[PDB]
Design a protein around this ligand. Structure first.
Ligand SMILES: Cc1ccc2c(n1)N(C)[C@H](CO)CCNC2
Ligand SMILES: Cc1ccc2c(n1)N(C)[C@H](CO)CCNC2
Ligand SMILES: Cc1ccc2c(n1)N(C)[C@H](CO)CCNC2
Ligand SMILES: Cc1ccc2c(n1)N(C)[C@H](CO)CCNC2
Length: 339
């Protein structure tokens, strides 16, 4: 559909609000699926499952209700599921089902077989600037979409970006995402990717996602993130200084974009100025990017992950296989009424 960015975002917001104000609930149950393999573990696990009637594969995120309460994650788990059931964008993973039982919360999403961007980045070492720019353009469009809905993402990093069968990104986890008008205050995220105003316990806004994009672009093009150290306290000291050194192989345009995204003063940071996302989209580093062609998935990707079929797990790693235990008695019912 050929139309302005403004009209596209206006309709996107109308559609999001309809699902936001009436969330879907209870759309499957656990014994509708066969368990295949644990894909990741950290109050929660991600497991490859297969729907018994259709044969379709899904990634099932399982959260232990007792651990969420103790780790003070209740509102974040409610945010994640409510946001995931309401969004719709080419680079966002689709939630197909959600439900809960006596012990756990379950979010059943499309399974993306290509693996995490993190794995591919670490195998190759670094991405060339055109390869990094292909991925970065998808994040810029996704953040323009999310921010226009008043959503902040708050966990951009290579482990949260999966690569699909066409070589495009799927942003998968929404565990820290939140609908925010104005400012928000929770400490969350991952140390290497935190903006200075999060570290300093300030009231912060969507500018923290544009800072995180600067960290991601740096890490994709260098092979390592710009602020790193053995301990979080030392990482935080480097972030708040904002002193950054760039590899000599970085182009001048890449360095300029990064100095404007990794701007410690949030009131001067690209993405947070009067022209908003257009200061990023119009930057010289993106001069070759065809934004419509990226959105429509018409650009050939830099590479296609190797995998054998929709159930192949070869691009994910191996974890001890543990039970999914469901109590005879219901736990934490009041806390998760809305889920
Ligand atoms: C499909 C899949 C596998 C492994 C993981 C995963 N998803 N995700 C996105 C989690 C966050 O939920 C973080 C990355 N590591 C484990
Ligand atoms: C009762 C309540 C309201 C709002 C919030 C909340 N609890 N908590 C504790 C979360 C963490 O889950 C972050 C702080 N801001 C939102
Ligand atoms: C440059 C331009 C114009 C119009 C649009 C556009 N880009 N994109 C890529 C959006 C998403 O941002 C969807 C396609 N239609 C509207
Ligand atoms: C294997 C399995 C099944 C069911 C349960 C279980 N384990 N355990 C041990 C839990 C967790 O302490 C408590 C008992 N209720 C359900």
């Amino acid at each position: 559909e050929q139309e302005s960015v403004k009209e596209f975002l206006a309709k996107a917001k109308e559609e999001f609000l309809k699902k936001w104000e009436s969330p879907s609930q209870n759309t499957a149950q656990l014994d509708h699926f066969d368990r295949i393999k644990t894909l990741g573990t950290g109050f929660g696990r991600v497991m490859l499952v297969k729907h018994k009637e259709t044969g379709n594969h899904y990634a099932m995120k399982i959260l232990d209700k007792q651990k969420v309460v103790k780790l003070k994650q209740i509102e974040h788990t409610l945010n994640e599921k409510r946001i995931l059931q309401a969004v719709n964008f080419p680079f966002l993973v689709k939630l197909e089902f959600s439900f809960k039982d006596n012990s756990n919360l379950y979010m059943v999403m499309e399974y993306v077989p290509g693996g995490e961007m993190f794995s591919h980045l670490r195998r190759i070492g670094r991405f060339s600037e055109p390869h990094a720019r292909f991925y970065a353009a998808q994040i810029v469009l996704t953040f323009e979409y999310l921010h226009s809905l008043d959503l902040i993402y708050r966990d951009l990093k290579p482990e949260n970006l999966l690569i699909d069968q066409q070589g495009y990104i799927q942003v998968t986890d929404f565990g820290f995402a939140k609908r925010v008008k104005g400012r928000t205050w929770t400490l969350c995220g991952t140390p290497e990717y935190l903006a200075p105003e999060i570290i300093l316990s300030k009231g912060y806004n969507k500018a923290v996602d544009w800072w995180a994009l600067g960290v991601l672009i740096y890490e994709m093009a260098a092979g390592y993130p710009p602020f790193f150290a053995d301990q979080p306290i030392q990482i935080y000291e480097k972030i708040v200084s904002g002193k950054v050194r760039f590899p000599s192989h970085f182009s001048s345009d890449l360095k300029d974009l990064l100095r404007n995204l990794l701007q410690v003063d949030l009131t001067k940071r690209f993405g947070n100025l009067k022209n908003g996302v257009n200061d990023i989209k119009n930057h010289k580093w993106f001069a070759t990017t065809d934004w419509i062609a990226i959105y429509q998935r018409k650009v050939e990707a830099p590479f296609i992950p190797k995998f054998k079929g929709p159930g192949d797990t070869s691009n994910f790693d191996d974890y001890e296989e543990e039970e999914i235990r469901v109590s005879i008695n219901e736990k934490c019912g009041k806390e998760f009424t809305e889920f």
